[PDB]
Amino acid sequence: TSILDIRQGPKEPFRDYVDRFAKTLRAEQASQEVKNWMTETLLVQNANPDCKTILKALGPGATLEEMMTACQGVGGPGHKARVL
Amino acid sequence: TSILDIRQGPKEPFRDYVDRFAKTLRAEQASQEVKNWMTETLLVQNANPDCKTILKALGPGATLEEMMTACQGVGGPGHKARVL
C-alpha cells in the first residue's frame, strides 16, 4: 500500500491511526530524511478534524507519545476492540 | 543530496532547476507514486517566487513542457553558458 493512502477514520482512535501510519511507513522504501518529511507532512494532514486540531496545538516539535496522550480521549472503540 | 533540499535560485532558469530536481528525484529511493507526489508538492513549493506563482495558477497535473512554456524567461540566463 502507500503511505499516501493512510487517513484517519472519523471515529478511529488516534492510536490505531498512528499505528497504521507507522507500519505503512516502515514498509515504504525511502530515505530516513524523506520518511521524516512524510511524517511531518502527512500524519497531521491526514488526521480527523479533532485529532488534527489537537496535533496542531502541540506544534511541529510534538513527539509521538505526546500526540497519543493528547488524543487518547477522542473517537470510538475502533476496529481492534473485542466485544465477541 | 536529498530531494527535500532542491531549491530554485532567485534568477535560476526554471529548466535548470527542473534538471536538478529530476536528477535528484531519479536517484531518490521511493515508489513512483511517492515520486509523483514529491513532484506535485516539492517542485512547486521549492520554486522561486515568480515561478511558484505561475506554477500554482497552472495547477496540478500540468505537464513539464507546459510548466517550461509558462516559466520561460522568468529570471536570468543562469550558469550553463560559457562566456570565457
Quote the distance between the C-alpha of residue B29 and its chain's center: 19
d(CA A13, CA B31): 28
Cα of B31 to nearest chain A Cα, Å: 7
d(CA B1, CA B13): 20
By what method was this entry solved? Answer: X-ray
Secondary structure (3-state) at A8 = coil
Retrieve residue A21's grid coordinates.
Answer: 501510519
d(CA A37, CA A40): 5
d(CA B43, CA B55): 9
d(CA A47, CA A71): 11
Surface of B (30-49) touching A: CB under 8 A = 30-31, 33-34, 37, 41
Radius of gyration (Cα) for chain A, nearest Å?
13
Surface of B (2-21) touching A: CB under 8 A = 2-4
Residue of chain B whose alpha carbon sits nearest to that of A4: B34
d(CA B82, CA A78): 64
Residue A45: partners with Cβ closer than 8 Å, 6 or more residues away: A52
- State this model's resolution in angstroms: 1.2
A64 touches chain B (CB under 8 A): no
Q: Which of B29, B35, B41, B42 to mutate to test the interface with A (most CBs of A within 10 A)?
A: B29
Cα of A83 to nearest chain B Cα, Å: 38
Number of domains in chain A: 1
Q: Specify burial of residue B13 (Cβ count, 10 A radius: 0-12, 13-18, 19+).
A: buried
Which candidate from A29, A31, A41 shows the least CB-CB separation from B31? A29
HSE of A83 in the Cβ direction (CA atoms, 13 Å)?
A: 3
CATH of the domain at B3: 1.10.1200.30
d(CA A67, CA A58): 8
Residue B52: partners with Cβ closer than 8 Å, 6 or more residues away: B44, B45
Secondary structure (3-state) at B73 = coil
d(CA A71, CA A69): 5
Segments forming the whole domain that contains residue A75 = 1-84
CB B22 within 8 A of CB B46: no
